[PDB]
Each structure stands twice: as C-alpha cells, then as structure tokens.
C-alpha cells in the first residue's frame, strides 16, 4: 500500500495472503468463511501452485497465529480475459477450514441492493495488503491499510486510459499520494457500516500507483454476489 497506515492487532482480520512455492506473497485475498477465500482472477497466473497464509501480520517475524492452508479447488471466473481485465474475480476453496482467532475472521458479504446504495453510497472504503509501498520499491513486510474515497464512475472513466466496464469501480485520490499497488491484487476493499464491514470490491488494477490524475480500480463485488454464492455451494 503506497503511503497508508499500519494494520494493528485485530484491525484487518479478513486479510489473507497468497504465497507461492518460495513462500512469496504474490497476491492477497479476503476471508469469506472457513473454506472460501475471495481473490482476483489474474492473480492465478503468478504461480504454478500456491498456498494461503492467514493470521500473518508481518511477513518477516513468525509471531505465531500465522496459518498456511492448501487450496483444494480454484473457481476462476470463466469470463476473465487479460485483454480486458473484466470479470477479474475468483473464489478459492481450501482443503482445511480456517480457524478463527485474533486477527483471523471473515468479512461480511452484503446484498446487491443495499451495497449499491448505503455502501457504495458511503464516501470511503478500506483497502489493504502486503504489496509495494511506492512503485519501484520494496513490497511491504507489515500489513498496511488505507482509506480510499469512492470515485464517481464518470470521473473514473475520464481518468483511466482504458475502458472501465460496469464490473469495475474507481476508488482513490487524484492528487494525494496514497493508493494500493502491485502485490495488493486480489486484496480486499471492505466498507464499514456502523460497526460491521462488508466486502465491496477487490484490488484489480490501476495505472501506476498513487499516480497523480489516476485512481486505483477495483472489481465491483456487488455485480458478482450470486456468482460468489454459486461458487461457495460449488459451481
């Protein structure tokens, strides 16, 4: 996360990490339940095989609480294409159920209506991950978070050099140098309502990081709710 704050004890319990063979966290994920992890479809390319680490707050020191789980099945969105980056979503099922504990808890899924309104209506969302901190820099060793304001679709399209489909949405700053970055892909964009947090989108892509005049773009989870249910019941 470029220029964000640090996630304290129990502040970002839904964050999951996708580690490859060499245990390199190439992407992130959102804990949905004991077995399911929500992630970006494109992340399924940076590794022949991977595992999901949960409870990890600092990639360096192993302060316990960290737990690796193997992926049983990988349900990727059949409509994803690198040529368009549309339908950038994928659900992962783990072989072993994730034990909830301090710093390990799922995020709540909302409903299409009351998400599109109430949630997207809010002025800011929360995003996080163990990704680059400055673009052309190191990948963070501590889990970072950042409040990213909701950007209206029109300005979003006007800023992005590429086509912003209806399965996407912008969130970030125009001038302020704060924004998700590479390695944060698949990570969660949750939104707080009163005291609960609902998954609103997942880190998809963006043009550079904290690039002035550009915004970070995410997958609009709202559009995939039924698909998520399908995949959770397995389909």
């Amino acid at each position: 996360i470029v220029g964000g704050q640090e996630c304290k004890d129990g502040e970002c319990p839904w964050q999951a990490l996708l580690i490859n063979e060499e245990n390199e966290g190439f992407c992130g994920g959102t804990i949905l339940s004991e077995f399911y992890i929500l992630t970006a479809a494109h992340c399924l390319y940076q590794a022949k095989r991977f595992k999901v680490r949960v409870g990890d707050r600092n990639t360096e020191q192993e302060e316990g609480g960290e737990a690796v789980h193997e992926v049983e099945v990988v349900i990727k969105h059949n409509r994803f294409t690198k040529e368009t980056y549309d339908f950038d979503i994928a659900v992962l099922r783990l072989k072993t159920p994730i034990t909830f504990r301090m710093n390990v808890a799922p995020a709540c899924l909302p409903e299409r209506d009351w998400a599109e309104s109430t949630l997207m209506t809010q002025k800011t969302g929360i995003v996080s991950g163990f990704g680059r901190t400055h673009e052309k820099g190191r990948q963070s060793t501590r889990l970072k978070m950042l409040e990213v304001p909701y950007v209206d679709r029109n300005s979003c399209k006007l800023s992005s050099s590429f086509i912003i489909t209806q399965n996407m949405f912008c969130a970030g700053y125009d001038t302020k140098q704060e924004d998700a970055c590479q390695g944060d892909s698949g990570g969660p964009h949750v939104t707080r309502f009163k005291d609960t947090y609902f998954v609103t989108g997942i880190v998809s892509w963006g043009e550079g990081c904290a690039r002035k005049g550009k915004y970070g773009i995410y997958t609009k989870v709202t559009a995939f709710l039924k698909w998520i249910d399908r995949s959770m019941k397995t389909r």
């Binding site: 129990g10 319990p13 808890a105 799922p106 709540c108 009351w114 009163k194 609960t196």
Partner: protein, 55 residues
C-alpha cells in the same frame, strides 16, 4: 405514513429492505435479528465483519 430506508437505514443495524410501507431489516449470515426487528445479534464467537481485537 411510514416508509424509507433512507431516513437512517430504517434503524436496521445492517440490511434494510422496505416492504409495502414498513422498513423490514435483515442480518448477514452469522447474525440473528433481535426481537426488536432492527438489531443484529452475533451468533458465533467470531461473526463476520467484526474486528477481532481487544474489543
């Protein structure tokens, strides 16, 4: 007259879905709707969306 989930989410802790004229609230899986038909009581020890910190 009574209506609008716009007033203040209809006093729902979470999902609000007006039906006919009433507000009618709902709770995410893992929560149970309180008897007041507005609050959402967590069912398990670690409900979704809650920060598992020294709460």
């Amino acid at each position: 007259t009574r209506k609008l989930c716009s007033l203040d989410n209809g006093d729902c802790d979470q999902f609000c879905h007006e039906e006919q004229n009433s507000v009618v609230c709902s709770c995410a899986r893992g929560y149970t709707l309180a008897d007041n038909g507005k609050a959402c009581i967590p069912t398990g020890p670690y409900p979704c969306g809650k920060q598992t910190l020294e709460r």
